[PDB]
Each structure stands twice: as C-alpha cells, then as structure tokens.
Amino acid sequence: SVKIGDIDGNGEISSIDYAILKSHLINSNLTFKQLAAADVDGNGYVNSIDLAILQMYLLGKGGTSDIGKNRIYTYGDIDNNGIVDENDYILICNHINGTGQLSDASLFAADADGNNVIDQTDRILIEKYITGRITHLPV
Amino acid sequence: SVKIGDIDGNGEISSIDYAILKSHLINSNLTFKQLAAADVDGNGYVNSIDLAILQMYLLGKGGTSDIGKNRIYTYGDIDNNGIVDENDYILICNHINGTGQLSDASLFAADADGNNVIDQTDRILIEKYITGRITHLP
Ligand SMILES: [Ca+2]
Ligand SMILES: [Ca+2]
Ligand SMILES: [Ca+2]
Ligand SMILES: [Ca+2]
Ligand SMILES: [Ca+2]
Ligand SMILES: [Ca+2]
Ligand SMILES: [Ca+2]
Ligand SMILES: [Ca+2]
C-alpha cells in the first residue's frame, strides 16, 4: 500500500517524510514507491507544490488534501483507469523506447516485478497479463 | 496550540494518539486540552465516533476530516464567537451551578487557570478579564 505523503513508508505522516522529499527535490533519490507517495496533489509529477502542500499539512494549516490516505493503484494499470490493457502496454513501451516518459507517480504501477527499474521484463509481464498467459503480475 | 487528533500534543498524528483516546473512552482521563484535540468531528463531544474517524485516518481509509489541522482557541471565548463577554460568562456560570454543562471541547477555553476543573475560580477570573482588571487570563 502507498500512503500519500508517507515518503519513508513507516505508515505515519511526519516531518521526516517532508525532509526526505525536500532533499529529493535538490538531488533526486526517491524510489518508484516513494515517488507515488510523494505526488500529494495527484497530478502525476513530484515537485515543489507537493512539498508545499505537505508543509502546510504538517504545520496544521492545510486545506483538504489526500495526505494520509492510501493511494489507489493497480499493478500494470499505468494510466490508473482501473483496467490493465494495451493502452498500459503502450505507455510502458514508449517509456522504454525513449518516446515518452512515464509520469513520476505511474512508475510504481508500471514496475511489474518491483525492482525499481522499468525495462523489457516489465513490458513482457504486462503483455503476458493482458493476453491471459499469467494470472497476476509478480509484484 | 490544539491540533485535531494530536492527543499527546507532540505535533504529529500517530498510533499513540489513538491509543490515548481509546484508553480514555474506557476510563476517562484526558485533560481539557486533550479533549479539545480529541473532538475530531468538531461536534463538541468526545466519543467513539471521534475515535472511529481517527482509526480510519490512520489506516489510510478516511474521508475528509479535520485531523491534523490546528483549531484556534481563544481563552474565555466559550461560544467561539470571537469576543469574550457576558455570554461566555453565563455559559461557565451555568456549568458551575449545574444548570448547563459545557461541551467537552469548550472546557479548554473556559479553564482560566489550567487545572482541568471548571469552578468558581474560572468564574472570577473571566469576570476580571471581561472588566479589564486582569490583562490576560493565566
Ligand atoms: Ca512516514
Ligand atoms: Ca504533484
Ligand atoms: Ca489502464
Ligand atoms: Ca521492473
Ligand atoms: Ca501526536
Ligand atoms: Ca466529537
Ligand atoms: Ca464569546
Ligand atoms: Ca479551572
């Protein structure tokens, strides 16, 4: 499960989560799972606006946000429309071929073997899943 | 500062906060300030619904709530209308006299000496505050 804002993965939202995101925005260091947790506003990309929303939440000053909620994801569902199908395959293929970069927040769903790399193995697994040759993704 | 759901007052919302509130609902023990923090849904009373909302939040399953937000308190402003006047005084007097009980969440605003009791001392102190004899409630 991915908890929005829970950058260190410990299940609770704290100033350490914020510190890790702030450091990442200076020098990238977050895993795919952390990038999914870091996309506080849900627009797919991890940036200083996400950081700001997390700051306002932690200081008690925030409006309504998804911080603390479990993020809805399905492995292989890269566009997060609730189905794994050939449009998900296209997104990962273009990513691998250099003709379209996956959003920061969708890398976790694309990483079908959970090794924090997007490569041919992920594509093949999604291909097998779509065509019914495997019942689930290994992750 | 009162932060909603932050029962232990450490500035963050965690499983410890839930444990303290659950313990209180079994055997009452929260301070007035903790009661203010525990009224998650803002309805004035601290009960199992507040606990349930905190539980859902900590499991990542909650809807929209005020958990984590600061709730601004003005000492002596019992009706939360932004001024301290005779109407706040009446609310504390009735409470003391047993002719109307303050909500759990307003006890912190009424407690002029911070001893987690509302008694004749809180009445005298708000009187002095309203009439300007004391510059601020202790
Ligand atoms: Ca955390
Ligand atoms: Ca974002
Ligand atoms: Ca899809
Ligand atoms: Ca992979
Ligand atoms: Ca706390
Ligand atoms: Ca309540
Ligand atoms: Ca008032
Ligand atoms: Ca008192």
Residue given tokens 């987690």 in the structure block: B116
- Ligand 8 centroid vs B10 CA: distance in angstroms? 23
* CA–CA separation, A20 and B55 (whole Å): 26
How close B47 comes to chain A (CA, Å)?
Answer: 22
B27 DSSP 8-state letter: S
Q: How many CA atoms lie within 13 A of A34 on its CB side?
A: 19
CA A16 from centre of chain: 19
- Ligand 4 centroid vs A125 CA: distance in angstroms? 9
Protein fold of B2-71 = Type 1 dockerin domain (1.10.1330)
Relative to beta strand B70-71, strand B2-3 is antiparallel
Measured in angstroms, the resolution is 1.7
* CA–CA separation, B106 and A98 (whole Å): 60
Question: Quick check: B71 and B38 in contact, CB under 8 A?
Answer: no
Q: Which among B15, B60, B70 has CB closest to A68?
A: B60
Phi, psi of A112 (to 5 degrees): -70, -15
- The token duo for B16 is 């410890």
Residues of chain A with CATH 1.10.1330.10: 2-71, 75-139
- The token duo for B78 is 């019992």
- The token duo for B21 is 């509130």
* CA–CA separation, B100 and A11 (whole Å): 42
How close A87 comes to chain B (CA, Å)?
Answer: 29
* CA–CA separation, B72 and A44 (whole Å): 34
Q: Which among B14, B60, B67 has CB closest to A3?
A: B60
Phi, psi of B70 (to 5 degrees): -70, 140
CATH of region A75-139: 1.10.1330.10
Are the Cβ atoms of B60 and A12 closer than 8 angstroms? Answer: no
A85 DSSP 8-state letter: S
Q: What angle do CA A22, A56, B6 make, to 5 degrees?
A: 110
Question: Quick check: A123 and A116 in contact, CB under 8 A?
Answer: no
Residues of chain B with CATH 1.10.1330.10: 2-71
Q: Which residues of A touch B64 (CB under 8 A)?
A: 64
CA A100 from centre of chain: 16
